[PDB]
């Protein structure tokens, strides 16, 4: 019941899991992050990434959409995709990495 080291695209996606799971396991439901863990990362971890550490709500609602505070199996994903995209085209249509 343990994903041992993986192939390369797996290396990239597994890596996404482990960090995620470290927080998902913190509070209730070790398989999903709550509104507090989202807010913690968005506020603390995301100021650099998601320059919208205030109204986490909007994004939360889009992910939460089933009125499920638990950012579970690819409900969270929308943000995760917004994440990998944001790092790239944040405002990089001129310059953002340096």
């Amino acid at each position: 019941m343990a994903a041992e080291p993986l192939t390369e695209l797996e290396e990239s996606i597994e890596t996404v899991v482990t960090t995620f799971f470290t927080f998902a396991r913190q509070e209730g439901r070790k398989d999903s992050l709550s509104v507090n863990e989202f807010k913690e990362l968005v506020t603390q971890q995301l100021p650099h990434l998601l320059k919208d550490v205030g109204s986490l709500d909007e994004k939360m609602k889009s992910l939460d959409v089933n009125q499920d505070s638990e950012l579970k199996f690819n409900e969270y994903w929308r943000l995760i995709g917004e994440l990998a995209k944001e790092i790239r085209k944040k405002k990089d249509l001129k310059i953002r990495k340096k």
């Binding site: 019941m1 509070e27 209730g28 439901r29 070790k30 398989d31 709550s34 509104v35 507090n36 499920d68 505070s69 638990e70 579970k72 199996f73």
Partner: protein, 151 residues
């Protein structure tokens, strides 16, 4: 904020077996399979601790944990294997993150059901060969009955 405050301690280290009559036996700290006990102190001994908010249905809700460690069975999504979570010390005030390990227990005489407070259509079903999961119930035995062991 609004806290869900612990109501009362029911019974503890007692084991529930379903209409298939299978002791909820400990296979792992995340996976559990139902099988009639033969070592007796072999099944996971649960204890019920009720919490209170006016968001049940018509029945009061308790948390199922192993009397020694705080291993709760949580409700994932439909026919998805129960995830046994382990977190030091039982919470006295329940937030909205632990809404999966909450259980609406409807007792009928001797038999009893375990309804998920997270997703209504979920009920804890019992399999003959597979792990004791949760489900929407077609011919899976989502019945339970509490049978204690001798010692």
């Amino acid at each position: 904020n609004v806290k869900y405050n612990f109501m009362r301690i029911i019974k503890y280290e007692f084991i529930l077996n379903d209409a298939l009559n299978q002791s909820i036996i400990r296979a792992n700290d995340q996976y559990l399979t139902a099988a009639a006990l033969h070592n007796l102190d072999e099944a996971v001994k649960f204890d019920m601790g009720a919490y209170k908010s006016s968001k049940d249905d018509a029945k009061i809700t308790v948390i199922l944990r192993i009397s020694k460690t705080q291993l709760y069975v949580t409700a994932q999504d439909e026919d998805q294997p129960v995830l046994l979570k382990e977190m030091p010390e039982i919470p006295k005030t329940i937030t909205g993150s632990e809404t999966n390990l909450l259980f609406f227990w409807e007792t009928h005489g001797t038999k009893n059901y375990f309804t998920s407070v997270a997703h209504p259509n979920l009920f804890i079903a019992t399999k003959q060969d597979y792990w004791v999961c949760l489900a929407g119930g077609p011919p899976s035995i989502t019945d339970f009955q509490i049978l204690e062991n001798q010692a």
